[PDB]
Write a protein that binds this ligand. Structure first.
Ligand code: QSZ
Ligand code: QSZ
Ligand code: GLU
Ligand code: GLU
Ligand code: CAC
Ligand code: CAC
Ligand code: CL
Ligand code: CL
Ligand code: CL
Ligand code: CL
Ligand code: CL
Ligand code: CL
Ligand code: ZN
Ligand code: ZN
Ligand code: ZN
Ligand code: ZN
Lengths: 263, 263
């Protein structure tokens, strides 16, 4: 039928989607800024659709409850028909690809370690061989699932510790994990995706750093419900933006051009 | 109908697919070794098919002739029904994704610079600002197309030089490009994918090196003809192998465990 405004689900996560300063009482898409706001504008332009940005109701990325089998987060909004597309730092995973469609990745990342500067930790192995420094992940995302599912000795040892550690080492938002690192005097390290780690490393007060290599290698993709008519065009649009260098320009724009910790 | 042996097209490119020493007179898949041989075995196992490895007849990756509009290389073998699947260092690109299907990537790479050690070159900008040192690409692949299509000032300048340079700066195989670097006393630099660059850097006589950052960011994917019944299962299999850490183990096995230039 007639063209319809596409409902985009996304998540308030810096620097992907942020409320512009003093824009809370304004309307529509102009309230928001960030890498994924710019990406949504390009994808929509290349695919020829109008869209409305909406923030996922429960503030989550997406996981399947083991008991009820219900999907939450942005994945759930696609699965249950609340949104037409997710344009967000949403990680491509096997269990998600079974229930939604992902474009080719628009950004690469891996799980990484954030420390407060000076923390005597250089690797995941270092974390796993000690107990003075606590460590955790975002509480309902692909990083937590990576540790839950891993059969690699070091990551299995870390999961065995994290899943029963008290108080909980898991946090509700990236901002909570960063704040916990910054206030714990070196006694908390946060396991998060390298993209968010490297963004925070360039933000005042410049007191965190990414240490060691990444624990895995994957990417974010644009997600659509299974069988959506948008998937084919969205996928090609990502590849076009990649080959044009636009994705590189946007990463520099939101990570490093605006860095607050020097050159 | 009944299960049929899947015809795999691939390419003789180290360390992805190599003839085992003294295996030329043997038969079937056991003749070959490499990263993509190991990957094919896993993909076939996870998808439940038997397969036959075949080397692409024309030795090419795949490009579309501007005059005849015919696809060559492994892409052509899929397009024209000569093979059922390509398991190879085949780069995900927009023009290929229009005519074949790609899985999610199984390996990341970017275009990079190979120099003979000691060459006074650190970047693509350095190459573009001088003429003493020639530079080129593989003659019928995604790297050449990257330069042909780029609107970025430095890469446009490099393309303007490469496309009319005489003798040709393009080579027929990666091995030819490496040999040209090694014998040109520093007066030829080779533009190739970072994966092949970093492999050769660890091979005797240990006289080349990768310099500068990568020029772009992309990946290899497993390719199937449009609408093939294999695509969905192959795509999930790649993600499963990724999440299990198998792709990481295979990269280490074929790049660094067997490195000949020290630790
Ligand atoms: O779509 S993926 O998650 C498939 C797995 C890995 C591949 C195995 C190296 C990967 C890497 C970069 C990226 F940007 C996305 C992805
Ligand atoms: O499937 S891709 O070619 C889509 C573009 C880039 C994305 C833009 C960063 C990418 C990166 C790693 C990889 F392994 C594959 C690909
Ligand atoms: N990008 C992740 C969320 C962040 C994390 O888990 O580290 C996801 O899609 O679940
Ligand atoms: N992987 C490339 C070939 C090598 C290159 O062009 O550098 C392709 O699929 O065309
Ligand atoms: C339920 As708990 C181990 O995250 O506090
Ligand atoms: C046709 As030519 C410029 O590669 O020798
Ligand atoms: Cl808009
Ligand atoms: Cl997941
Ligand atoms: Cl912009
Ligand atoms: Cl076999
Ligand atoms: Cl191409
Ligand atoms: Cl093995
Ligand atoms: Zn365990
Ligand atoms: Zn760093
Ligand atoms: Zn030009
Ligand atoms: Zn290097």
């Amino acid at each position: 039928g007639a063209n319809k405004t596409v409902v985009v689900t996304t998540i308030l996560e810096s620097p992907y989607v942020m409320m512009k300063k003093n824009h809370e009482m304004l309307e529509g898409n102009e309230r928001y800024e960030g890498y994924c706001v710019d990406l949504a504008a390009e994808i929509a332009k290349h695919c020829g659709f109008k869209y409305k940005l909406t923030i996922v109701g429960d503030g989550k990325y997406g996981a399947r409850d083991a008991d009820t089998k219900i999907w939450n987060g942005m994945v759930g909004e696609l699965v249950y028909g609340k949104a037409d597309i997710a344009i967000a730092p949403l990680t491509i995973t096997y269990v998600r690809e079974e229930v939604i469609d992902f474009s080719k990745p628009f950004m690469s990342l891996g799980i990484s370690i954030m420390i407060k500067k000076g923390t005597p930790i250089e690797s995941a192995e270092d974390l796993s061989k000690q107990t003075e420094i606590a460590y955790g992940t975002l509480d309902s995302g692909s990083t937590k699932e990576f540790f839950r599912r891993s059969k690699i000795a070091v990551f299995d040892k870390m999961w065995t510790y994290m899943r029963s550690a008290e108080p909980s080492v898991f946090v509700r938002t990236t901002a909570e994990g960063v704040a916990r690192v910054r206030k714990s005097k070196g006694k908390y390290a946060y396991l998060l995706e390298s993209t968010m780690n490297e963004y925070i490393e360039q933000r005042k007060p410049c007191d965190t750093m990414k240490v060691g290599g990444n624990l895995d290698s994957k990417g974010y993709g644009i997600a659509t419900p299974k069988g959506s008519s948008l998937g084919n065009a969205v996928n090609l649009a990502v590849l076009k933006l990649s080959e044009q260098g636009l994705l590189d320009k946007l990463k520099n724009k939101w990570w490093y051009d605006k860095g607050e910790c020097g050159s």
